[PDB]
Amino acid sequence: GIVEQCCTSICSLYQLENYCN
Amino acid sequence: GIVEQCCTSICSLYQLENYCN
Amino acid sequence: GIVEQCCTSICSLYQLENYCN
Amino acid sequence: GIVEQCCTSICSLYQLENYCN
Amino acid sequence: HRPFEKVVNKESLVISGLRHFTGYRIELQACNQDTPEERCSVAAYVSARTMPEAKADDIVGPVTHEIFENNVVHLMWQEPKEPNGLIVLYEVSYRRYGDEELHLCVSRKHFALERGCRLRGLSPGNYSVRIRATSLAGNGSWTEPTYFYVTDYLDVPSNIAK
Amino acid sequence: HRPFEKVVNKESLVISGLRHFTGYRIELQACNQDTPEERCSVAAYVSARTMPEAKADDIVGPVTHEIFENNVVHLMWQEPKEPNGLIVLYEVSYRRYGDEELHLCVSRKHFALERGCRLRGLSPGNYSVRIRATSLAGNGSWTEPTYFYVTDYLDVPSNIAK
Amino acid sequence: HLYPGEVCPGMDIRNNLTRLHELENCSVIEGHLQILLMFKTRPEDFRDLSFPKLIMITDYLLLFRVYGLESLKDLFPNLTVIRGSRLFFNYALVIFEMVHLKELGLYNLMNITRGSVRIEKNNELCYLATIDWSRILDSVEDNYIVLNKDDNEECGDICPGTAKGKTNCPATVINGQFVERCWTHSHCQKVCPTICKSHGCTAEGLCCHSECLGNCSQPDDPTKCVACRNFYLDGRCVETCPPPYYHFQDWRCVNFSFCQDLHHKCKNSRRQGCHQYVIHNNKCIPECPSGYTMNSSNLLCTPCLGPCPKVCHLLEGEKTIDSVTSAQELRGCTVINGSLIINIRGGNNLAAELEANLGLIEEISGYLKIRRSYALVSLSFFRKLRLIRGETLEIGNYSFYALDNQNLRQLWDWSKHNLTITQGKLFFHYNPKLCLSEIHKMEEVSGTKGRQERNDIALKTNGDQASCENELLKFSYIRTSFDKILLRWEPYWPPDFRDLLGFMLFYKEAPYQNVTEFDGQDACGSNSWTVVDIDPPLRSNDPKSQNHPGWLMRGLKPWTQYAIFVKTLVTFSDERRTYGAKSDIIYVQTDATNPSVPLDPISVSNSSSQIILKWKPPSDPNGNITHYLVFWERQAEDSELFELDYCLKGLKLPSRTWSPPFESEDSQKHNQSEYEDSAGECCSCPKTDSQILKELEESSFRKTFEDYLHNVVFVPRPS
Amino acid sequence: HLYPGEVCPGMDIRNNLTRLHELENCSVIEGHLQILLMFKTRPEDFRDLSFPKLIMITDYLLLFRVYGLESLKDLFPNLTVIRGSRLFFNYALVIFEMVHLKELGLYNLMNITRGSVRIEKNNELCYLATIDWSRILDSVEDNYIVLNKDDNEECGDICPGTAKGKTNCPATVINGQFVERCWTHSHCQKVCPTICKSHGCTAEGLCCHSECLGNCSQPDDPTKCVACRNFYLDGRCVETCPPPYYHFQDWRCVNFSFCQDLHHKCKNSRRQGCHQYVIHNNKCIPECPSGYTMNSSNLLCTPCLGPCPKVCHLLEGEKTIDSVTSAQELRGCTVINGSLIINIRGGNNLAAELEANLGLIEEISGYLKIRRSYALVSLSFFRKLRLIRGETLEIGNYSFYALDNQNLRQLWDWSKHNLTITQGKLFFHYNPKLCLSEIHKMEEVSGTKGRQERNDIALKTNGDQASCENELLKFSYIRTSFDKILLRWEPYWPPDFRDLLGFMLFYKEAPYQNVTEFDGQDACGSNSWTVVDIDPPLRSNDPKSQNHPGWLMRGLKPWTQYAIFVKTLVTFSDERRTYGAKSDIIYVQTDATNPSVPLDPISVSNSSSQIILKWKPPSDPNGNITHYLVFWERQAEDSELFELDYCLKGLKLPSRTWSPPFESEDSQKHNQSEYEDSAGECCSCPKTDSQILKELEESSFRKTFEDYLHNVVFVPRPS
Amino acid sequence: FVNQHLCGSHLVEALYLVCGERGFFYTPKT
Amino acid sequence: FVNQHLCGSHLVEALYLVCGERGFFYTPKT
Amino acid sequence: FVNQHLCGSHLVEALYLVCGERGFFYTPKT
Amino acid sequence: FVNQHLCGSHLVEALYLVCGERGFFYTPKT
């Protein structure tokens, strides 16, 4: 979950590379 | 304290049950 | 002791017999 | 409407920060 | 012994049957309570005098006089009883050289004092008046500024107040 | 500008070199940064009159008169340099044998009009001088209504000047 | 012919607009529709490409953060009304953080069915406070429409006040006066007769067919309307659907072939439906209620053998009920293979739909939990609940981990419920309007107080407001006056009189007896709560008591229904104690006096022998006024007249002549704030604090002294 | 000699006055006596005997439940002081539960050593505004006198002395009125100066030697003393025991033979509860210190090279610590084979004594406990405490249990306070003034904080009315005026900036420039720090906000320093993520200003040309006043004066001393133009007059909606 | 009372009324 | 003893009127 | 204040003290 | 991207500037 992933823990790039172009 | 005790400071009823007659 | 016996309950007479001669 | 904002109603510090350039 | 007048679920009243030119001091109180007995508040004293009209400002009675080679006039006039504000009053004073100046006031105290006020000096000669024109409502008789030769109430170069 | 003054951390200050019992005023401000401007507030305003001195109302220069040939006394002097505020009034009751005895209720303006007071035609016999000058104190040229004996149209010296 | 164009499922688009070319010119949608998150966008491309062939939708419509647009009538000029079936977060219309707009401009709505809206954080958009939802919505309070350029006090009204067609804007009446509503600077609102609009209303203002709705072309026919009420069929709006066609989705009615080919398909490789739609109660629905199953014979929810409950087994590790959508995800079911939570929020009072969706689950495998619901007041929706099993538990092996319900006045009516607990440790804190009485009763009907333990309850909390009670006091005697009130009531003497600390007198005004308990508002002073502490009385336990508790007044107003009650100053201990003692909320009239003249003694006349007067009552009500009285009187002309003349040096005037001109105030320009604070009532009013903590500790000091004394001085000597 | 009596130790006066045959000829005291338990008595029994042979006391004396017994001056006149070697629950003398107690005597007392007296519930007593205790105690903070006939507010107390017969009457004002300091209506009190107060005044001469005390039969004679500060031997007060003699219990010396047989009487075949006295420190004391024991017959203690711990197996498997009595019962114990409990009371500190008593102790075999210690502040007196080992726990495996401590705010500096709470839990509720970070340090030094669990520690408490914090605020710019002031400071963004809701500011006047470093006691407000909040700024710039926070204070007195500081206002946390943050305070002047008006002028003269002008300062003197500008002229000549005061007109009508117009004319514009602006000035308006509860809910609700949106849309795919 | 007091006729009324018919010591300014 | 609760003066009067005037005897404990 | 209205050239001096060195104007009601 | 914790509009804008064009999606196809 984004806010669980990001608004509590830090969301690095590799934590986010799934859904970019 | 029939008058002065109540008009020198705070008063109370237990004061006043005895100034009864 | 004392209050544990009688400041808790309506204790018995025997707890005052305990404080007898 | 700083005047209508604050002389006819309530205002704020930011509310007049904008009328400031 | 005093007026007793009552109002019923209102906030205004118009009392009537009133003398006029009367500033009435009003004691004012009220009672929610009537069955055991009334419990009425203090008297907020308040007053007002009635709206005046052209009712008695003008003079009640006839303005009259006398004529005398005694050099005197016993002047008279009737003053209204319900007076309208400032009573009209006509001051008079003449002058001749050598101890022959004259006078007549209209004022409530002077009327009460000198029975009006009494002229002294009526005889032929040069007799004139200063007239500060005064009438709060106008009248049928003023001092009527001219030069008033001592003949009688005659043509405007003579005594005139009517 | 206006006469100036400053203070050296007092709570009190005075003035002198000033006309006796004469009307001035106050403007006490509060300067806090005097150098770019006298940074002193609006003031706490108040007036003043203190310590009258009847000596000035009394004739600093005595007052003789003119013996007019019409049997009249015209009152002549030169008013003070400090007349003790303002010269107010005299008691000039005059009336007899008719109505021309020349009463004068005299201000600055009236004395300027007349340069004094011009009495009636003289009267050999007793004569009261109840004439008095009036500053705000009230002493003037007063002795009493002491009935001076006119001596064949003369000798009415109101010269005590108390 | 009312919904001619074909229907296309729900979908969203979040990129280039070519995904809007997917349509072969639809009319109405099934399923959710949203379009949001497009930056590289600009209002000119939206001038064209409006889709007016649309008619209606049912599910929620959401728009969010698409950069570049001015208004809506160049998008959806024909989009009738939104139903509510699956709201998003208890809301239907969500136009949120939409930038660049200037006015809404949407005229097709006239009566939205259910749900609510939020149109918020719009730093460009105006023309919403000139739009009336009162005549279109029923849940007109749950809607948060805020933080817009209408809210930030910038925009103006240029809505047509002269009929460009044949109407000025309607003087629609909300917010007090008539609000000269509009959607745009051009369009004006539509008003309709009250009952008639509920089944549509003409362009003129006439009623229409009962199954017509909203806009109607021909008044009083079922086929030339624009909207329907319940269903339709093949051209007309209806109330039913006889066979072979059967109800479907609360807006239409279909064929056996329709439902048939529905169940022949699924999300994936299953040509028999995973949510296979089937017939029952003449409705073509996806799955049966409890007590029914099916063999694939003719598409009817067949009655079954024994029960047939609904194990709505959740793939999650936990479930939240914070929205109605959660309820819909658990509507109709009756059983859990997991746990459950309530997390209601906001001043909404959602228990209605909850009891509509739920109030039918009565089996739980795991654990319950309730939190942080400022508007929640009861669990009355749980009118079926039987069991909270132990298959999983919260921290420390807990099951009913209740907490933080800042307005929960009470739980169910503990008179008709039968229920089970099997495992489970409890947990209760910050329940400031939950009564310890019903809590203990919940322990009694728990079926568990062997496993109940210490530290679970915070008796220092959980009922600190809105006094609950188990004991009572009474005014054994009362005697009063117009300004004073002497009260004498029965005593309380707990297991230790020493624990007593005094009494409170709650007292305050009230115009009628409609007033009620007031304990659980803000516990500070300014609550209309004038209160006072008084010391408790001498005991004289050895004789029979002849000195009851009492108190007497410092101030009152006459003829006042002063509501009054009390409460005891009590010492706390770690004991399942009584609440203490109170008395009921008695309402008491006060005796009589008028010492107050009424204000405004007018002074004027209206004729020569007539007068004119004004009275205005004191703020002292002084009984019910019954009549006034006056003692007027005359003044002869004083020596004020007989001390002057006016033939004199100059002239003066004691003013015999009329001069009450009825002046007024030009200096007293009291502007909109009609209030001042030259002085006041009690500035930083005296209201006690931890300054009384000292006295509490002093009484405890007294207790401890007597305790140590009475302990070591006496001693048993049997042995 | 001065001290001739026979050794007469403690005894209970109870249920029969015949026990004064134990006072057949006595004059000495040891331990205590107990005057109580006489219900069938009256003045005959207390005039049947009166035994004035006494000398003094050491520990205390007692009074309880005996009728009559008018006073003591007849009973025990020769009675000097109490040593306070023991106490009765933090008091050294009792006055309690007496009926028909007219007065007391005790006109022979000069220095009460330790503790205090206790007066209570003797409702027939007065003449106690003539009796100081600081002049009879070397320390007065804990004394406590209450509930007598004086608490009815009568007894004007005509005491003699300088009045009613000169009798060497030292009156001594202490508060604002001298008083004939005495004890009765027919006695007096003895005042000393510090020249000889240490060891006592005497009107016999003027002082005694400085090893006497209290009184002395001869002035300036070191053997004719009456009291001894330090010691005693052979007819004279001294200050040391010469070393063939040895010291026993603060009141004497004896020879080695005396101490050894005063033991060895009990060193025989009968246990009479006696004790193991041994010579040590030149002192015949009860037992051996640590690293000192005695298993021999050399009659002196001797150091075991190993540790000789002062193990003391508790009774009851526990003990409460409630008083200095319970404390002294363990001084000279270090290890506790038991479990202690600390339940202290009263507005009195005791860390001084406990650091003398408990300030050696190192090892509790079981657990600590803390309970409603009101006036306590610290574990400071626990300065050797290391090991609360895991062998005993309260209900729920607790190794530590603290609660209701309304003033605890810091334990230690953690320099090298190396402890181990080896096993077991914690418990913390209603522990407000103690920070959380300190508790976290306690869990750190503890070991496995993993032993902790949910709700083992509170988070809604413990730092409420003030607190330390982790991060600090700072400033960027300030600007000021004479009537207005600006502050603009740094912006703060928590990791979830939504969690923040604004800044909380505080300020005040402060001519005294060392004001509190306090957060704020906003308990129903109730603290005159005029506080107002502020909406937070935007997230406009993503790296760093170009808009700094700000709120403008205004309406302040000119040339007035002002303390100003602020602090966060944050959503109630869920884990130990942040303590908010704060700013320090700044004494800030207010700029100079032109318009202040001086008050109360004067205008009268001593002479005509003279005028005395005098005045006062303003209400706003505006700092350093340079000087007082002045103007005046002959502004006295209007046109209102040459045309007045004719003959029959008024004589002195324009006699205008203090002329009308220049004076400050009356006014009625209370607040119209620029003060109706400031019309939210108010009274009984709280300092927290805002239902932030609703606002907290609104913020949480918005967060819920946005989180729902984003966490739905974010990843509907694995890529 | 709190800062105000039991003077005037409030005093005498409440003084009679605290007992009613027992009687009281009449205390105008005792 | 008494059905009421025995705290304080309660307890003192109780022990009084239960004593029979012989009391509780402290044997020398040390 | 902001609790209630705010008028006069208090506004003017406020804007002067606040804005300062980034330029300020006003709708002159003065 | 910031190595601070991302939330709200900051998160939205940062995420767009991260992925940008033809990267990020709602997928009802799943």
PDB file of N, CA, C and O in Angstrom, chain F residues 95-134:
ATOM      1  N   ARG F  95     -31.175 107.532  40.164  1.00  0.00           N
ATOM      2  CA  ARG F  95     -32.564 107.777  39.784  1.00  0.00           C
ATOM      3  C   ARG F  95     -33.263 108.701  40.780  1.00  0.00           C
ATOM      4  O   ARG F  95     -33.207 108.456  41.989  1.00  0.00           O
ATOM      5  N   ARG F  96     -33.936 109.752  40.295  1.00  0.00           N
ATOM      6  CA  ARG F  96     -34.631 110.706  41.163  1.00  0.00           C
ATOM      7  C   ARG F  96     -35.406 111.776  40.400  1.00  0.00           C
ATOM      8  O   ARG F  96     -35.043 112.131  39.273  1.00  0.00           O
ATOM      9  N   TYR F  97     -36.462 112.303  41.040  1.00  0.00           N
ATOM     10  CA  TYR F  97     -37.214 113.478  40.574  1.00  0.00           C
ATOM     11  C   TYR F  97     -37.650 113.316  39.120  1.00  0.00           C
ATOM     12  O   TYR F  97     -37.699 114.272  38.343  1.00  0.00           O
ATOM     13  N   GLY F  98     -37.992 112.084  38.767  1.00  0.00           N
ATOM     14  CA  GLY F  98     -38.238 111.700  37.396  1.00  0.00           C
ATOM     15  C   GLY F  98     -37.347 110.536  37.025  1.00  0.00           C
ATOM     16  O   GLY F  98     -37.102 109.664  37.864  1.00  0.00           O
ATOM     17  N   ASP F  99     -36.848 110.509  35.782  1.00  0.00           N
ATOM     18  CA  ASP F  99     -36.256 109.289  35.247  1.00  0.00           C
ATOM     19  C   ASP F  99     -35.035 109.545  34.359  1.00  0.00           C
ATOM     20  O   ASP F  99     -34.765 108.759  33.445  1.00  0.00           O
ATOM     21  N   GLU F 100     -34.271 110.613  34.610  1.00  0.00           N
ATOM     22  CA  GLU F 100     -33.034 110.883  33.862  1.00  0.00           C
ATOM     23  C   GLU F 100     -31.946 111.234  34.869  1.00  0.00           C
ATOM     24  O   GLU F 100     -31.707 112.405  35.170  1.00  0.00           O
ATOM     25  N   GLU F 101     -31.270 110.205  35.364  1.00  0.00           N
ATOM     26  CA  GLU F 101     -30.116 110.370  36.231  1.00  0.00           C
ATOM     27  C   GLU F 101     -28.929 109.555  35.733  1.00  0.00           C
ATOM     28  O   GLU F 101     -27.902 109.492  36.415  1.00  0.00           O
ATOM     29  N   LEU F 102     -29.039 108.964  34.542  1.00  0.00           N
ATOM     30  CA  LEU F 102     -27.899 108.487  33.767  1.00  0.00           C
ATOM     31  C   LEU F 102     -27.152 107.376  34.508  1.00  0.00           C
ATOM     32  O   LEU F 102     -25.999 107.510  34.915  1.00  0.00           O
ATOM     33  N   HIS F 103     -27.873 106.280  34.696  1.00  0.00           N
ATOM     34  CA  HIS F 103     -27.251 105.044  35.138  1.00  0.00           C
ATOM     35  C   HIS F 103     -26.437 104.452  33.995  1.00  0.00           C
ATOM     36  O   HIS F 103     -26.845 104.504  32.831  1.00  0.00           O
ATOM     37  N   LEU F 104     -25.279 103.893  34.335  1.00  0.00           N
ATOM     38  CA  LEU F 104     -24.323 103.382  33.356  1.00  0.00           C
ATOM     39  C   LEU F 104     -23.746 102.093  33.920  1.00  0.00           C
ATOM     40  O   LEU F 104     -23.023 102.138  34.916  1.00  0.00           O
ATOM     41  N   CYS F 105     -24.030 100.956  33.290  1.00  0.00           N
ATOM     42  CA  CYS F 105     -23.479  99.677  33.740  1.00  0.00           C
ATOM     43  C   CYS F 105     -22.345  99.377  32.764  1.00  0.00           C
ATOM     44  O   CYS F 105     -22.576  98.942  31.634  1.00  0.00           O
ATOM     45  N   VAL F 106     -21.119  99.629  33.210  1.00  0.00           N
ATOM     46  CA  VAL F 106     -20.014  99.999  32.334  1.00  0.00           C
ATOM     47  C   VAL F 106     -19.073  98.815  32.165  1.00  0.00           C
ATOM     48  O   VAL F 106     -18.602  98.243  33.153  1.00  0.00           O
ATOM     49  N   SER F 107     -18.797  98.448  30.917  1.00  0.00           N
ATOM     50  CA  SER F 107     -17.760  97.490  30.573  1.00  0.00           C
ATOM     51  C   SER F 107     -16.512  98.221  30.094  1.00  0.00           C
ATOM     52  O   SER F 107     -16.410  99.449  30.167  1.00  0.00           O
ATOM     53  N   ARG F 108     -15.542  97.447  29.599  1.00  0.00           N
ATOM     54  CA  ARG F 108     -14.511  98.005  28.733  1.00  0.00           C
ATOM     55  C   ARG F 108     -15.136  98.806  27.608  1.00  0.00           C
ATOM     56  O   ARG F 108     -14.711  99.928  27.310  1.00  0.00           O
ATOM     57  N   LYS F 109     -16.173  98.247  26.990  1.00  0.00           N
ATOM     58  CA  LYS F 109     -16.764  98.872  25.817  1.00  0.00           C
ATOM     59  C   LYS F 109     -17.468 100.165  26.197  1.00  0.00           C
ATOM     60  O   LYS F 109     -17.391 101.161  25.474  1.00  0.00           O
ATOM     61  N   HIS F 110     -18.118 100.181  27.358  1.00  0.00           N
ATOM     62  CA  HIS F 110     -18.871 101.355  27.780  1.00  0.00           C
ATOM     63  C   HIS F 110     -17.940 102.472  28.236  1.00  0.00           C
ATOM     64  O   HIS F 110     -18.153 103.642  27.898  1.00  0.00           O
ATOM     65  N   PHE F 111     -16.907 102.145  29.009  1.00  0.00           N
ATOM     66  CA  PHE F 111     -15.954 103.186  29.370  1.00  0.00           C
ATOM     67  C   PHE F 111     -15.231 103.701  28.137  1.00  0.00           C
ATOM     68  O   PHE F 111     -14.895 104.888  28.067  1.00  0.00           O
ATOM     69  N   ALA F 112     -14.984 102.829  27.160  1.00  0.00           N
ATOM     70  CA  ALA F 112     -14.423 103.280  25.894  1.00  0.00           C
ATOM     71  C   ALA F 112     -15.392 104.213  25.178  1.00  0.00           C
ATOM     72  O   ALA F 112     -14.975 105.186  24.539  1.00  0.00           O
ATOM     73  N   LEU F 113     -16.690 103.930  25.280  1.00  0.00           N
ATOM     74  CA  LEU F 113     -17.699 104.793  24.680  1.00  0.00           C
ATOM     75  C   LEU F 113     -17.682 106.171  25.319  1.00  0.00           C
ATOM     76  O   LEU F 113     -17.748 107.193  24.626  1.00  0.00           O
ATOM     77  N   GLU F 114     -17.592 106.214  26.645  1.00  0.00           N
ATOM     78  CA  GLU F 114     -17.822 107.438  27.393  1.00  0.00           C
ATOM     79  C   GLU F 114     -16.546 108.088  27.892  1.00  0.00           C
ATOM     80  O   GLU F 114     -16.513 109.312  28.035  1.00  0.00           O
ATOM     81  N   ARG F 115     -15.496 107.298  28.125  1.00  0.00           N
ATOM     82  CA  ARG F 115     -14.313 107.712  28.878  1.00  0.00           C
ATOM     83  C   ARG F 115     -14.647 107.999  30.336  1.00  0.00           C
ATOM     84  O   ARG F 115     -13.977 108.808  30.980  1.00  0.00           O
ATOM     85  N   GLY F 116     -15.676 107.340  30.867  1.00  0.00           N
ATOM     86  CA  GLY F 116     -16.074 107.528  32.249  1.00  0.00           C
ATOM     87  C   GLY F 116     -17.570 107.437  32.436  1.00  0.00           C
ATOM     88  O   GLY F 116     -18.251 106.670  31.747  1.00  0.00           O
ATOM     89  N   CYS F 117     -18.085 108.216  33.383  1.00  0.00           N
ATOM     90  CA  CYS F 117     -19.514 108.328  33.618  1.00  0.00           C
ATOM     91  C   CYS F 117     -19.859 109.788  33.837  1.00  0.00           C
ATOM     92  O   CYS F 117     -19.152 110.500  34.553  1.00  0.00           O
ATOM     93  N   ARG F 118     -20.951 110.215  33.219  1.00  0.00           N
ATOM     94  CA  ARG F 118     -21.394 111.602  33.244  1.00  0.00           C
ATOM     95  C   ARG F 118     -22.695 111.616  34.031  1.00  0.00           C
ATOM     96  O   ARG F 118     -23.711 111.083  33.573  1.00  0.00           O
ATOM     97  N   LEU F 119     -22.659 112.206  35.217  1.00  0.00           N
ATOM     98  CA  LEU F 119     -23.774 112.116  36.147  1.00  0.00           C
ATOM     99  C   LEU F 119     -24.870 113.101  35.742  1.00  0.00           C
ATOM    100  O   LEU F 119     -24.849 113.694  34.660  1.00  0.00           O
ATOM    101  N   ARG F 120     -25.845 113.285  36.626  1.00  0.00           N
ATOM    102  CA  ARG F 120     -27.007 114.121  36.362  1.00  0.00           C
ATOM    103  C   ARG F 120     -26.639 115.591  36.560  1.00  0.00           C
ATOM    104  O   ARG F 120     -25.468 115.960  36.676  1.00  0.00           O
ATOM    105  N   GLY F 121     -27.658 116.445  36.618  1.00  0.00           N
ATOM    106  CA  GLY F 121     -27.457 117.811  37.072  1.00  0.00           C
ATOM    107  C   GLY F 121     -27.252 117.849  38.579  1.00  0.00           C
ATOM    108  O   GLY F 121     -28.078 117.341  39.346  1.00  0.00           O
ATOM    109  N   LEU F 122     -26.158 118.486  39.008  1.00  0.00           N
ATOM    110  CA  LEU F 122     -25.709 118.493  40.399  1.00  0.00           C
ATOM    111  C   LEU F 122     -26.784 118.928  41.382  1.00  0.00           C
ATOM    112  O   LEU F 122     -27.798 119.517  40.997  1.00  0.00           O
ATOM    113  N   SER F 123     -26.555 118.639  42.662  1.00  0.00           N
ATOM    114  CA  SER F 123     -27.578 118.779  43.695  1.00  0.00           C
ATOM    115  C   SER F 123     -26.913 119.199  44.997  1.00  0.00           C
ATOM    116  O   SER F 123     -26.493 118.348  45.793  1.00  0.00           O
ATOM    117  N   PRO F 124     -26.759 120.521  45.232  1.00  0.00           N
ATOM    118  CA  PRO F 124     -26.331 121.000  46.555  1.00  0.00           C
ATOM    119  C   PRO F 124     -27.111 120.390  47.712  1.00  0.00           C
ATOM    120  O   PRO F 124     -28.330 120.558  47.813  1.00  0.00           O
ATOM    121  N   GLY F 125     -26.402 119.683  48.591  1.00  0.00           N
ATOM    122  CA  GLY F 125     -26.980 118.889  49.652  1.00  0.00           C
ATOM    123  C   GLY F 125     -26.212 117.591  49.803  1.00  0.00           C
ATOM    124  O   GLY F 125     -25.189 117.374  49.160  1.00  0.00           O
ATOM    125  N   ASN F 126     -26.719 116.711  50.663  1.00  0.00           N
ATOM    126  CA  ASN F 126     -26.073 115.426  50.890  1.00  0.00           C
ATOM    127  C   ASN F 126     -26.104 114.564  49.632  1.00  0.00           C
ATOM    128  O   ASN F 126     -27.053 114.608  48.843  1.00  0.00           O
ATOM    129  N   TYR F 127     -25.046 113.772  49.450  1.00  0.00           N
ATOM    130  CA  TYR F 127     -24.855 113.004  48.225  1.00  0.00           C
ATOM    131  C   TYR F 127     -24.033 111.758  48.499  1.00  0.00           C
ATOM    132  O   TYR F 127     -22.870 111.860  48.899  1.00  0.00           O
ATOM    133  N   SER F 128     -24.617 110.597  48.226  1.00  0.00           N
ATOM    134  CA  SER F 128     -23.928 109.325  48.384  1.00  0.00           C
ATOM    135  C   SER F 128     -23.057 109.016  47.172  1.00  0.00           C
ATOM    136  O   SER F 128     -23.484 109.176  46.024  1.00  0.00           O
ATOM    137  N   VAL F 129     -21.822 108.591  47.441  1.00  0.00           N
ATOM    138  CA  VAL F 129     -20.977 107.940  46.445  1.00  0.00           C
ATOM    139  C   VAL F 129     -20.850 106.473  46.819  1.00  0.00           C
ATOM    140  O   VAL F 129     -19.981 106.096  47.614  1.00  0.00           O
ATOM    141  N   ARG F 130     -21.723 105.639  46.257  1.00  0.00           N
ATOM    142  CA  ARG F 130     -21.574 104.186  46.300  1.00  0.00           C
ATOM    143  C   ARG F 130     -20.998 103.666  44.994  1.00  0.00           C
ATOM    144  O   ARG F 130     -21.371 102.590  44.516  1.00  0.00           O
ATOM    145  N   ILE F 131     -20.084 104.432  44.402  1.00  0.00           N
ATOM    146  CA  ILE F 131     -19.452 104.067  43.142  1.00  0.00           C
ATOM    147  C   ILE F 131     -18.162 103.325  43.459  1.00  0.00           C
ATOM    148  O   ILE F 131     -17.401 103.728  44.345  1.00  0.00           O
ATOM    149  N   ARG F 132     -17.916 102.244  42.727  1.00  0.00           N
ATOM    150  CA  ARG F 132     -16.797 101.351  42.978  1.00  0.00           C
ATOM    151  C   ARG F 132     -16.342 100.699  41.688  1.00  0.00           C
ATOM    152  O   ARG F 132     -17.141 100.342  40.830  1.00  0.00           O
ATOM    153  N   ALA F 133     -15.035 100.513  41.597  1.00  0.00           N
ATOM    154  CA  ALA F 133     -14.397  99.838  40.484  1.00  0.00           C
ATOM    155  C   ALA F 133     -14.249  98.358  40.797  1.00  0.00           C
ATOM    156  O   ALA F 133     -14.188  97.945  41.956  1.00  0.00           O
ATOM    157  N   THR F 134     -14.193  97.553  39.742  1.00  0.00           N
ATOM    158  CA  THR F 134     -14.357  96.112  39.884  1.00  0.00           C
ATOM    159  C   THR F 134     -13.396  95.377  38.967  1.00  0.00           C
ATOM    160  O   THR F 134     -13.607  95.316  37.753  1.00  0.00           O
TER     161      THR F 134
END
